[PDB]
Design an enzyme around this catalytic site. Structure first.
Site, PDB file in Angstrom:
ATOM      1  N   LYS A 155     -18.211  30.979 -19.336  1.00  0.00           N
ATOM      2  CA  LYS A 155     -18.088  29.757 -18.543  1.00  0.00           C
ATOM      3  C   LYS A 155     -19.117  29.788 -17.422  1.00  0.00           C
ATOM      4  CE  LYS A 155     -14.701  26.875 -16.143  1.00  0.00           C
ATOM      5  NZ  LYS A 155     -13.271  26.767 -15.741  1.00  0.00           N
ATOM      6  N   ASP A 180      -7.432  28.194 -17.777  1.00  0.00           N
ATOM      7  CA  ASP A 180      -7.693  27.207 -16.701  1.00  0.00           C
ATOM      8  C   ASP A 180      -6.813  27.412 -15.451  1.00  0.00           C
ATOM      9  OD1 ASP A 180      -9.875  26.069 -18.115  1.00  0.00           O
ATOM     10  OD2 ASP A 180      -8.931  24.103 -18.380  1.00  0.00           O
ATOM     11  N   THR A 214      -1.385  17.310 -12.869  1.00  0.00           N
ATOM     12  CA  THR A 214      -1.489  16.199 -13.800  1.00  0.00           C
ATOM     13  C   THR A 214      -0.195  15.385 -13.644  1.00  0.00           C
ATOM     14  OG1 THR A 214      -2.785  17.582 -15.317  1.00  0.00           O
ATOM     15  CG2 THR A 214      -1.829  15.578 -16.233  1.00  0.00           C
ATOM     16  N   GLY A 258       0.816  -1.208   0.000  1.00  0.00           N
ATOM     17  CA  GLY A 258       0.000   0.000   0.000  1.00  0.00           C
ATOM     18  C   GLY A 258       0.850   1.259   0.000  1.00  0.00           C
ATOM     19  N   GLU A 259       1.822   1.308  -0.907  1.00  0.00           N
ATOM     20  CA  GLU A 259       2.787   2.414  -0.974  1.00  0.00           C
ATOM     21  C   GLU A 259       2.122   3.630  -1.611  1.00  0.00           C
ATOM     22  OE1 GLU A 259       4.596  -0.322  -3.600  1.00  0.00           O
ATOM     23  OE2 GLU A 259       3.683  -1.425  -1.933  1.00  0.00           O
ATOM     24  N   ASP A 316      -0.496  23.483 -12.948  1.00  0.00           N
ATOM     25  CA  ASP A 316      -1.032  22.528 -13.929  1.00  0.00           C
ATOM     26  C   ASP A 316      -0.586  22.881 -15.351  1.00  0.00           C
ATOM     27  OD1 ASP A 316      -2.486  20.161 -14.583  1.00  0.00           O
ATOM     28  OD2 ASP A 316      -4.345  21.285 -14.934  1.00  0.00           O
ATOM     29  N   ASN A 347      -3.741  23.059 -21.572  1.00  0.00           N
ATOM     30  CA  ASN A 347      -4.192  24.337 -21.006  1.00  0.00           C
ATOM     31  C   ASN A 347      -3.665  25.576 -21.742  1.00  0.00           C
ATOM     32  OD1 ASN A 347      -5.650  22.979 -19.003  1.00  0.00           O
ATOM     33  ND2 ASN A 347      -3.956  23.051 -17.527  1.00  0.00           N
ATOM     34  N   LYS A 398       0.635  22.388 -18.826  1.00  0.00           N
ATOM     35  CA  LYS A 398       0.666  21.348 -19.852  1.00  0.00           C
ATOM     36  C   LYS A 398       0.033  21.919 -21.140  1.00  0.00           C
ATOM     37  CE  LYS A 398      -3.608  19.490 -17.941  1.00  0.00           C
ATOM     38  NZ  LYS A 398      -4.373  18.303 -17.476  1.00  0.00           N
ATOM     39  N   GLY A 405     -17.531  23.653 -24.653  1.00  0.00           N
ATOM     40  CA  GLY A 405     -16.846  23.023 -23.512  1.00  0.00           C
ATOM     41  C   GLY A 405     -17.811  22.442 -22.489  1.00  0.00           C
ATOM     42  N   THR A 461     -20.381  24.300 -18.081  1.00  0.00           N
ATOM     43  CA  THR A 461     -20.375  24.469 -19.539  1.00  0.00           C
ATOM     44  C   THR A 461     -19.737  25.802 -19.954  1.00  0.00           C
ATOM     45  OG1 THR A 461     -21.791  24.502 -21.538  1.00  0.00           O
ATOM     46  CG2 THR A 461     -22.761  25.400 -19.506  1.00  0.00           C
ATOM     47  N   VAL A 462     -19.196  25.839 -21.174  1.00  0.00           N
ATOM     48  CA  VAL A 462     -18.623  27.055 -21.764  1.00  0.00           C
ATOM     49  C   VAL A 462     -19.372  27.347 -23.061  1.00  0.00           C
ATOM     50  CG1 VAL A 462     -16.540  28.190 -22.649  1.00  0.00           C
ATOM     51  CG2 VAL A 462     -16.347  26.494 -20.818  1.00  0.00           C
ATOM     52  N   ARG A 520     -12.980  61.648 -10.829  1.00  0.00           N
ATOM     53  CA  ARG A 520     -11.795  61.666  -9.967  1.00  0.00           C
ATOM     54  C   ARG A 520     -10.850  62.818 -10.296  1.00  0.00           C
ATOM     55  NH1 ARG A 520     -12.703  57.175 -12.435  1.00  0.00           N
ATOM     56  NH2 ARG A 520     -12.161  57.466 -14.657  1.00  0.00           N
TER      57      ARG A 520
END
Length: 809
Positions: A551, A663, A680, A105-106, A645, A650, A647, A531, A535-536, A456
């Site tokens: 999104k 993302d 990931t 169980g490593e 993340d 993305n 990769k 997406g 949803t996108v 201003r």
């Protein structure tokens, strides 16, 4: 009517509670644990004091024959070491059988994961065991406290006083803990020292010429000089009881920091110049230049260094060591010690005669700044021109529209500015007219008035009228001069459009229009879904006809997963991002059932599909995409954001072929060391896996994974592996190899330096930051200015559009 309360008290964790027994540990127990952990994947790098602490957290478990320990498919949490008896295994309800000394169980130590095998007890046997939560928490606490202790010890070592806060944190992570038995020699007299030791626990005896001199305790340190010079150790130091030291070797210090003495003097000079009313107004690059170019000289005590009328080119001086006294004729003005300086009036007026006298009070070291030093570093013979130039540059380098222009373009823009005056009541801009000038306030104050409402007040170094550079439109507000003697810098549209080129102009024209458009949910029409959390939708804004991405995220899905703090943090990061290679958030929305993010629509497709259309990248193609990611990542690290993340999945391409990082669900604002395992697997850095803490350096590891993909094709670690444990094993212990068709020395070296397992030695993670990557020979023909300025031809420009398919928002 009141709600009931209701789960998660019937897993494999609750099974182990039943089998748990209390058991006081013997010498036979601890040694047996120590051996199994030292051979294990996660604990093999750990020292004995960390392993001893972990070994004490092991719980004892008893099993009769026929009792199930682990079932297949169940979510696993414990790691076990077989203490007694036999334990059979069923690979797919069938394989092995193992007894005392062995472990299983490593994978459970790293992450919650489904059990491969199912282990039943064959005889009356017992297990040592530990749960993931306790194990990770313990490693977190050992590492955090180790770092903090070592950090406050570094603060007590006087040679490090002139290091900055960031530099001290960096060298703290270079500390190696070293344990010594009684009677063991730490350093021997006459050996050539290259290590600084600091006692954390215990006592040591100092011997000079075999004679007992004194005793060192917690907080004592030696070998300061060994980090600067190469000389014989002055004493033999022997541990008197069991002793722990934090050590820093010169070899690692030179990797982390470079020459320690150079850095210290640079920091002294840089801080001194930032106190000068003149040198304040120059950039950090110009101040580092002055520091690196200054003449540094030693003088003896009671020595007239500079004397009225007999001084020639010297205009400014900074004390680095010792003390000097400043005189005007025979009148003493003051004593200058380390970091103090003098000569503002001579820097401003370089032709006027030197009237002061500087006499040393003791042996000293001085940095002298001459006329030639100033001209070379401040880039002009005239000092007021330089100040004036940099005042404008500072202001425009903060603005999105100017800061990604090249140095040639930016310089042409600065030279083009001219000055004009206004008096009290004057309209500089009147609401209604079609503007063409951009303004920076040099002196005075102005009011912004829109539809008769004061919005201003702006003053010295504020700017206005930016949109007129991009668009031919009516002015939205008036700008009225508040006072007399108002003075502005201005540049006209026509000059800006001469300097800037097509691609960059189109980028800015699109970005500012969509950003500044005030959008309501009423005004949007869904076109199609692009997406599938939520949803996108590709949406269309009816009034302007500008297209966006919307999104949508289920509010009920967030509450059920306890992502309420995380979504707030994602919004906060996503909202602050204003960089050309990062996705731009326009607005957020809120309603009964949803949180919405409204972003720019990115139409060029995914990077992961571009590289597959191109195949293996050429050097210039790999330079382009890796360079783009570098600048985006650099932007985030400057704001203490770790992306986590990184990769190709993305990264999208825009119409022009330039990249957009998307993302930000895994992104985090770092406050110290991060410990949560996120990302990931194939792209995750070893320091994330090992659980002793990490920061921004993990993104630089992933950058090396991406480069390998681009050039070589497959992933470097765990390419043909589904099971997460074996991916992680390959990342930690696997040999990095390259195919026979990859031979470019500079490509190979950069990939090797990016995939250095030790974060401290990883290229880009030292004192110079990303500069070391940007200056690496791999990028020797690569123009970073042209990348950011959109002046490079990208590897791939798509012919058409392609897509995959309380709270304050």
């Amino acid at each position: 009517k009141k709600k009931a309360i209701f789960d998660d008290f019937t897993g494999e964790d609750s099974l182990m509670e039943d089998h748990l027994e209390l058991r006081e540990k013997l010498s036979e127990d601890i040694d047996m644990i120590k051996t199994s952990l030292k051979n294990n994947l996660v604990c093999s790098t750990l020292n004995d004091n960390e392993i001893l602490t972990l070994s004490n957290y092991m719980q004892f478990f008893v099993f009769k024959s026929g009792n199930l320990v682990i079932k297949q498919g169940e979510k696993g949490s414990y790691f076990f070491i077989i203490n007694s008896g036999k334990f059979d295994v069923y690979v797919n309800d069938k394989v092995k059988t193992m007894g005392k000394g062995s472990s299983f169980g490593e994978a459970a130590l790293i992450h919650n994961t489904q059990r491969s095998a199912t282990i039943i007890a064959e005889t009356d046997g017992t297990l040592w065991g530990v749960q993931r939560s306790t194990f990770r928490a313990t490693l977190k606490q050992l590492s955090n406290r180790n770092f903090n202790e070592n950090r406050t010890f570094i603060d007590s070592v006087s040679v490090f006083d002139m290091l900055t806060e960031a530099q001290k944190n960096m060298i703290t992570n270079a500390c190696v803990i070293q344990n010594f038995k009684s009677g063991e020699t730490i350093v021997k007299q006459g050996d050539y020292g290259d290590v600084l030791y600091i006692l954390k626990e215990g006592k040591a005896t100092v011997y000079i010429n075999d004679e007992e001199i004194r005793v060192l305790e917690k907080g004592s340190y030696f070998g300061e000089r060994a980090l600067l010079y190469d000389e014989p150790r002055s004493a033999t130091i022997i541990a008197k009881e069991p002793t722990a030291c934090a050590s820093i070797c010169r070899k690692l210090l030179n990797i982390v920091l470079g020459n320690l003495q150079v850095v210290l003097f640079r920091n002294i000079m840089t801080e001194a110049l930032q106190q000068s009313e003149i040198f304040k107004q120059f950039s950090g690059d110009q101040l580092n230049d002055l520091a690196d170019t200054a003449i540094v000289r030693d003088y003896p005590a009671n020595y007239n260094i500079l004397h009225k009328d007999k001084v020639k080119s010297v205009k400014y001086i900074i004390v680095l060591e010792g003390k000097v006294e400043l005189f005007l004729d025979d009148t003493s003005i003051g004593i200058l010690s380390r970091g103090m300086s003098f000569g503002d009036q001579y820097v401003l007026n370089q032709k006027q005669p030197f009237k002061h006298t500087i006499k040393s009070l003791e042996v000293c070291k001085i940095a002298l700044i001459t006329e030639t030093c100033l001209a070379d570093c401040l880039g002009n013979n005239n000092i007021d021109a330089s100040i004036d130039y940099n005042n404008k540059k500072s202001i425009i380098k903060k603005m999105y529209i100017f800061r990604y222009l090249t140095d040639k373009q930016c310089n042409l823009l600065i030279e083009a500015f001219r000055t004009t005056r206004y008096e009290e009541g004057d309209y500089i801009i009147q609401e209604g007219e079609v503007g063409s000038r951009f303004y920076i306030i040099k002196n005075g104050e102005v009011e912004i008035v829109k539809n008769k409402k004061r919005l201003r007040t702006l003053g010295k170094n504020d700017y206005f009228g930016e949109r007129a550079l991009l668009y031919d439109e009516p002015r939205t507000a008036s700008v009225i001069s508040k006072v007399n003697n108002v003075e502005c810098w201005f540049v006209d549209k026509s000059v800006f459009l001469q300097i800037i080129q097509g691609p960059m102009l189109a980028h800015l024209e699109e970005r500012i229009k969509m950003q500044d458009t005030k959008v309501e949910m009423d005004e949007l029409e869904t076109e199609r879904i692009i997406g599938r959390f939520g949803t996108v939708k590709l949406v269309h804004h009816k009034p302007t006809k500008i297209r966006y991405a919307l999104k949508c995220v289920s509010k009920r899905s967030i509450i059920n997963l306890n992502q309420q703090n995380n979504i707030k943090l994602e919004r906060e990061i996503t909202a602050e991002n204003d960089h050309p290679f990062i996705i731009r958030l326009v607005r957020t929305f809120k309603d009964s059932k949803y949180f919405y993010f409204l972003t720019e629509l990115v139409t060029g497709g995914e990077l992961y599909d571009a590289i597959r259309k191109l195949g293996l990248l050429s050097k210039s193609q790999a330079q382009f995409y890796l360079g783009s990611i570098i600048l985006a990542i650099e932007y985030l690290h400057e704001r203490n954001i770790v992306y986590r993340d990184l990769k190709p999945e993305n990264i999208l391409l825009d119409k022009q072929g330039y990249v957009k990082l998307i993302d930000f669900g895994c992104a985090k604002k770092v406050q110290g060391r991060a410990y949560t395992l996120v990302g990931t697997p194939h792209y995750m850095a070893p320091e994330v896996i090992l659980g002793k803490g990490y920061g921004c350096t993990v993104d630089i590891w992933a950058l090396g994974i991406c480069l390998y993909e681009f050039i070589c094709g497959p992933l470097p670690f765990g390419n043909d592996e589904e099971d997460q444990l074996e991916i992680f094993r390959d990342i930690l212990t696997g040999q990095l190899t390259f195919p026979d068709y990859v031979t470019d020395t500079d490509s190979i070296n950069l990939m090797k330096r990016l995939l250095c397992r030790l974060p401290q030695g990883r290229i880009g993670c030292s004192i110079n930051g990303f500069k070391d990557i940007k200056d690496h020979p791999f990028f020797s023909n690569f123009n970073w200015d042209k990348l950011a300025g959109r002046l490079l031809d990208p590897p791939l420009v798509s012919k058409s559009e392609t897509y995959a398919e309380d709270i304050d928002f």
